Design a protein around this ligand. Structure first.
Ligand SMILES: Cc1cc2nc3c(=O)[nH]c(=O)nc-3n(C[C@H](O)[C@H](O)[C@H](O)COP(=O)(O)O)c2cc1C
Ligand SMILES: Cc1cc2nc3c(=O)[nH]c(=O)nc-3n(C[C@H](O)[C@H](O)[C@H](O)COP(=O)(O)O)c2cc1C
Ligand SMILES: O=C(O)c1cc(=O)[nH]c(=O)[nH]1
Ligand SMILES: O=C(O)c1cc(=O)[nH]c(=O)[nH]1
Lengths: 299, 299
């Protein structure tokens, strides 16, 4: 039995990594992710300059997941670039760098600088991604960034959107992975006890993660798995167990990202997840992920 | 203490009703809903002619809700029109008729005929609703339908869409209520044991209801509550308890629709929900819904 994944000219010990933004902002966090049992890691979605992010509380753990409006608190692009360039032990595992410029211009400028580090060190861009704005952003990055990269996608909720998004993504051969999904946007958690919202920014509206989002994540993983056969899908959303991960891979996921569960449990979770996924595969008589990836049975 | 709701020239004993499509397709179900403790009921979203709907299994109950791709199985407009015109006991409770024409023309033609029955009997249209198409549809319906009505909305996931949707709806004074929300569209449930999807239509993709959707429902209820101050909001999504309903009302809901929970429990649920909401209100020292409707506290 093996959880090994081979993709993007890299070998991964297992499909697991953090979801961008979860436990990957500080040096300590990046180190902890590198030292963890995870197959990879992704750095916090960065902007050109450090960002304080939104006022607190801006994250709330919930019985069925989480809600957040972090507001991109990050150490800035130079920080994550320097980690990728000078600090990350690529001997331990490959590194993804998540980028979330606040404009096309910002992404272009960061990508221009990232190019050299990707070339020299092998850091892989996960570009945090209105289909016109999407086409423009990808066009700009593809134009200036001389490497394959991946895109972190918001969830879509109908086939028309799955088709529209896939059509655009398929126009960009440099997009070699698609990460499905980011949060289900702008949920509103209300605490019955306090008769209030639970996060401060944006009147309590924030992205949902965790158990809430698993079927949506699976839908999106599978939708793009089907519609972008030339591309890899990374799953993200609602993974708390090896069984959840199994579902992601069955839907078509190559890598499996862990946000909310990781936020609650810390990087030790990856030891548990590898163990559980191996346990699931053992019970189901699977030896490799290739044996069932994308093989979800329809009726 | 009173769960009384007053809206659209009607008095409702309590805010509870079935969600359209749940236990409201047949004469039997409609009578059962009328005989229930619910404040109201809505008939299955109708098309001009009967529809068989999608191949089964097309609904699956889940730990955290439900997934369905029913495909609008319904007895056709004439059937629901006849129920409203000739059968429904308005002395028991008001009646909503859900309409879901597969084209604007179909809606227009059904509304032309519904007009007389709305006038004569007081049945209230809930029109099951692309913002261009939306405005166009509402214009066409408003043209031929000389009555107040409401619209059943899909969930939106950002403020851009809340704003755009609200702007359109606010163009139409006849739209006196907005029902938030229809299902979170096209989730994909995978059974880990069978390594398959759980519904047959559309490769297993289907609308999510129940616990999955509550924060999204609350977000939409509140978003439209804020943006459409001239209208009422009907809450729909993730109501299992009086406390969930409390949350709907706190977010801005006038009426509270129950889908998945009602599917699983049957119409006796309304007796439990009315009792539970009164229990919540008693603990919280509320006597009427007016006292906390829309009063969710932000930070
Ligand atoms: C604390 C918090 C911060 C996040 N920051 C980012 C971010 O920087 N960039 C990004 O693409 N996604 C970010 N996400 C979204 C996650 O990467 C992930 O898409 C989402 O949480 C769904 O996964 P989950 O169900 O495992 O939480 C963040 C999520 C949370 C909970
Ligand atoms: C079995 C099934 C059939 C449904 N049929 C309709 C329909 O006819 N028209 C409609 O507007 N919504 C329909 N819905 C969506 C519900 O009205 C409701 O918006 C959704 O289920 C969310 O509410 P819930 O969490 O209480 O289930 C249906 C939902 C289910 C579960
Ligand atoms: O930084 C954040 O607040 C954030 C970014 C993102 O892409 N997704 C999310 O849920 N939060
Ligand atoms: O009939 C259906 O399939 C259906 C209609 C609708 O509006 N919502 C839903 O979840 N299902």
């Amino acid at each position: 039995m093996s959880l090994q994944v081979n993709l993007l000219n890299n070998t991964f010990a297992n499909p697991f990594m953090n979801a961008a933004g979860v436990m990957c902002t500080t040096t300590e966090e990046l180190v902890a992710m590198t030292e963890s049992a995870s197959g990879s890691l992704v750095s916090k979605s960065c902007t050109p300059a450090l960002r304080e992010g939104n006022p607190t509380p801006r994250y709330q753990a919930l019985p069925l997941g989480s809600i957040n409006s972090m507001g991109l608190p990050n150490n800035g692009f130079d920080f994550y670039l320097a980690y990728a360039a000078e600090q990350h032990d690529y001997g331990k595992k490959p590194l993804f760098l998540s980028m979330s410029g606040l404009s096309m211009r910002e992404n272009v400028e960061m990508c221009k600088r990232l190019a050299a580090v990707a070339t020299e060190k092998g850091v892989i861009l996960e570009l945090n991604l209105d289909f016109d704005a999407m086409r423009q952003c990808l066009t700009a990055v593809s134009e200036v960034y001389p490497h394959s990269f991946g895109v972190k996608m918001p969830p879509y909720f109908d086939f028309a959107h799955f088709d529209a998004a896939a059509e655009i993504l398929n126009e960009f051969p440099k997009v070699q992975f698609i990460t499905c999904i980011n949060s289900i946007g702008n949920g509103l958690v209300i605490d019955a006890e306090t008769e209030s919202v639970v996060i401060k920014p944006k009147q309590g509206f924030g992205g949902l993660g965790g158990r809430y989002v698993l079927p949506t994540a699976l839908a999106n993983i599978n939708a793009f798995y089907r519609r972008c056969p030339g591309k890899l899908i990374f799953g993200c959303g609602g993974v708390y167990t090896g069984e959840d991960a199994f579902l992601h891979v069955l839907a078509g996921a190559s890598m499996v990202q862990v946000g909310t569960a990781l936020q609650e449990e810390g990087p030790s979770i990856f030891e548990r997840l590898t163990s559980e996924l191996l346990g699931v595969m053992a019970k189901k008589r699977y030896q490799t992920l290739d044996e069932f990836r994308g093989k979800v049975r329809t009726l």
